[PDB]
Amino acid sequence: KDVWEIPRESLQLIKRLGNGQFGEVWMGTWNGNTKVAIKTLKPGTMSPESFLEEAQIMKKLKHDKLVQLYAVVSEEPIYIVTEYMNKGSLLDFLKDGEGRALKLPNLVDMAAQVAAGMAYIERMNYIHRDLRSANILVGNGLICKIADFGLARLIEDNEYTARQGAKFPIKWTAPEAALYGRFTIKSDVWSFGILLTELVTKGRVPYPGMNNREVLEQVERGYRMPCPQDCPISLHELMIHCWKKDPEERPTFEYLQSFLEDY
Numbered sequence: 001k002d003v004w005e006i007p008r009e010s011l012q013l014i015k016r017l018g019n020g021q022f023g024e025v026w027m028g029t030w031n032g033n034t035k036v037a038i039k040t041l042k043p044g045t046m047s048p049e050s051f052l053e054e055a056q057i058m059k060k061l062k063h064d065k066l067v068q069l070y071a072v073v074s075e076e077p078i079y080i081v082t083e084y085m086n087k088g089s090l091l092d093f094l095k096d097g098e099g100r101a102l103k104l105p106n107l108v109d110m111a112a113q114v115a116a117g118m119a120y121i122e123r124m125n126y127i128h129r130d131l132r133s134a135n136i137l138v139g140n141g142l143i144c145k146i147a148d149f150g151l152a153r154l155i156e157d158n159e160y161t162a163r164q165g166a167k168f169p170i171k172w173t174a175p176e177a178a179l180y181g182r183f184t185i186k187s188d189v190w191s192f193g194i195l196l197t198e199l200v201t202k203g204r205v206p207y208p209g210m211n212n213r214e215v216l217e218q219v220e221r222g223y224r225m226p227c228p229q230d231c232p233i234s235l236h237e238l239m240i241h242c243w244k245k246d247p248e249e250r251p252t253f254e255y256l257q258s259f260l261e262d263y
Helices: 048-058 090-094 104-123 175-180 185-200 212-221 236-242 253-261
Strands: 011-018 025-030 034-039 069-073 079-083 136-139 143-146
Touching (some): 048 079, 090 136, 104 143, 104 185, 175 212, 185 236
Antiparallel strands (some): 011 025, 136 143
């Protein structure tokens, strides 16, 4: 029988943690002693086969800076049981005073963690496609992990041409991806670049006064974001590095991981 399969009896949902277009994520315990997170699938929403494509990828990706899969309940409603992160979303962790009081050297640290996780996915020939503050979960001791592999794909030749329909976060998504549906690890690099922006401005929304419509034209014409306040030019140059038009010209997460790891 399946090694990851588990009996819905051993799961005791206790609190809603978040939502999704295909399901609601909950907090609950497994076998009465381990805190877990359950990513359920709303019945009339998506195919059990599809929902499960995320779990399939999760069983193939194991890194410490990546939310780990604990089990799966393959019968409707589907369940994806994973590691529970105390602090919650990086986005909301910054939007307060706990992680908000956080000083640079500390923020740079968490960033280095996200690069390490990305570097792994890089080597694994995977693509996240939805990299950003809200999808980064924070655990105890300022630990940061990448979560939500709903749109993650194993890179074929080198990119992924979506159905040219799905709508992605215009502000975090690279231009060649949202205009040609040409996604690559380099596209996440662009997104990493915008995450720095967030992680550096207390979880502010990228491209302040503009809208997905506007942001689409400036970036295109070659205009990027300016160095955020109390933000070194040093790592803003890192951000403009991540926002280059030619993806080949953008750095690799390996580089990125070390760069932030050194200061």
